Design a protein around this ligand. Structure first.
Ligand SMILES: CN(C)c1cccc(Oc2cnc(Nc3cccc(O)c3)nc2)c1
Ligand SMILES: [Cl-]
Ligand SMILES: [Cl-]
Lengths: 306, 306
């Protein structure tokens, strides 16, 4: 038993991390097969940060201007190109540590592990959720750009995030591995509106199920509700609307606990309308929304999904 | 910026994880050089866990009773012996991925990363604190026994914990890698009292410094406190007493922020007495105590490992 924010083991990703330097600036790159991926603002200086012309800056560069180091071994760069906001440096050697992998663009509300890195060397690993407003709340210092987010299914690493910037609000923004930013953000040193955020309803319900499985049951009540009534409450409390697809995804947790999904929705409704009265759920004094139903099952391997 | 509960990169430890099966009992082992370390209760049957005579059970065991799988390959047990509560299986093949390592017995209040494993395969990684009462509040399901906890310093993995059991209360107990249990616990299926626990006061103060570094400052006040007077309030709220040694350890964080240690104590004194009034610190609605002063500096400094 127990329930803890749990990241994926990072070994497979560690072996892909390298250090990329262009003139002054160093950040991290991801070496897969014979291509290194890194944020394109590596080719930038503070003179250029408010409105970089990335096409012109890249024209001034040549293969040998990109210093790429995998641990202690220097890599030979044989080509470069820009795809959206990432650079792809072709190297003469395929990474012998390349895992089985895919590139994926995740949906808001999905979770992933981040391997925070500096100078191509790993520093730590933690779980993030892609907020509804397409930011993440991580731990990213100077030089952490190019650190990636990922999920592991058996033996395939699905890379879904590369870190590019911290907004003036202190939250974080980045791209998929094709270089496309999550959300409306751009790679320039400017104040940028992140949309209104909201709480990931389906994740709160999954975490309430995890709590019941772990023996925390005080919030269970004698009430039920409708999807429509619940969604009225959710909208009032800045929660994401709950769809039948969400109900469907919560099915296996409903089955293990025997608590109908709409009964749990009535429990959540009461928590939102009355607060938690100073009590806790799974060690937390607020309602947690960064565990997916998948995340919960992984840590409660008693429920039946297949 | 940003402060997150962060585990060490787990790659070096993943390469040492194997599966140990004895009869119908499978758990995890740690393969360093030509020895596989695992909990000795792997040799117990269901009906033997009330009061096993491990000496007699081990005598009855033969090398071929221990099936050890390392990925696709099964190792060949050529030796079996017992060191306190850990079983040591000599194998005819040394681990080529053995990292630089030490065995270390940690102190209550210190933190370490746990690599949760099942059937010899790493499942996830998270950060824990050894509680003052020598338990840990982890996330462990059946078969997780043998999962290890560790720290990394530079390039050396310091193994400090091996998981052995879940207490009937749902917290967790284990040994150092010499097989000595942390706390008053023994490896028999008995109800065992874990001592009264306390909050790690030095860690809470370290975490408050982390919040100030990340822009959370509302808790700060212009109140003064003596160490002795703060300890009167701490004892009322089941906080462990703060010593000069603790004050000294927080020095670097006091220097970085310009907030004297005892002034931070005055801040914590108010938070314990009046609570948080619904406000949060670093996203949390309660006081966090699983970050050491080192953890805070390490994170806010970007320290890496290679
Ligand atoms: C997207 N992103 C992170 C980005 C984009 C383009 C250039 C780029 O490179 C920089 C930006 N800023 C600075 N220094 C700096 C110091 C104090 C205040 C200040 O606003 C800026 N140094 C390099 C980063
Ligand atoms: Cl995830
Ligand atoms: Cl630690």
């Amino acid at each position: 038993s127990g329930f803890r924010k749990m990241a994926f083991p990072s070994g497979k990703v560690e072996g892909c991390m390298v250090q990329v330097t262009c003139g002054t600036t160093t950040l991290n790159g991801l070496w897969l097969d014979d291509v290194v991926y890194c944020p394109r603002h590596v080719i930038c200086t503070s003179e250029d940060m408010l409105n970089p012309n990335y096409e012109d800056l890249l024209i001034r560069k040549s293969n040998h201007n990109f210093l790429v180091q995998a641990g202690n071994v220097q890599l030979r760069v044989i080509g470069h190109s820009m795809q959206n906001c990432v650079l792809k440096l072709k190297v003469d050697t395929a990474n012998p540590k390349t895992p089985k992998y895919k590139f994926v663009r995740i949906q808001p509300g999905q979770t992933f592990s981040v391997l925070a890195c500096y100078n191509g060397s790993p520093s730590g690993v933690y779980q993030c959720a892609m907020r509804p407003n397409f930011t993440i709340k991580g731990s990213f210092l100077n030089g952490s750009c190019g650190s990636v987010g990922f999920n592991i299914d058996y033996d395939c690493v699905s890379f879904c995030y590369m870190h590019h910037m911290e907004l003036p609000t202190g939250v974080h923004a980045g791209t998929d591995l094709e270089g496309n930013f999550y959300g409306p953000f751009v790679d320039r040193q400017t104040a940028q509106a992140a949309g209104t955020d909201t709480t990931i309803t389906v994740n709160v319900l999954a975490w309430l199920y995890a709590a019941v499985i772990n023996g925390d049951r005080w919030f269970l009540n004698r009430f039920t509700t409708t999807l429509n009534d619940f969604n009225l409450v959710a909208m009032k409390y800045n929660y994401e609307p709950l769809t039948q697809d969400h109900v469907d995804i919560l099915g296996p947790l409903s089955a293990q606990t025997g608590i109908a999904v709409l009964d749990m929705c009535a429990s959540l409704k009461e928590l939102l309308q009355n607060g938690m009265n100073g009590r806790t759920i799974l060690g937390s004094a607020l309602l947690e929304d960064e565990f997916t139903p998948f995340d919960v099952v992984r840590q409660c391997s008693g429920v039946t999904f297949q």
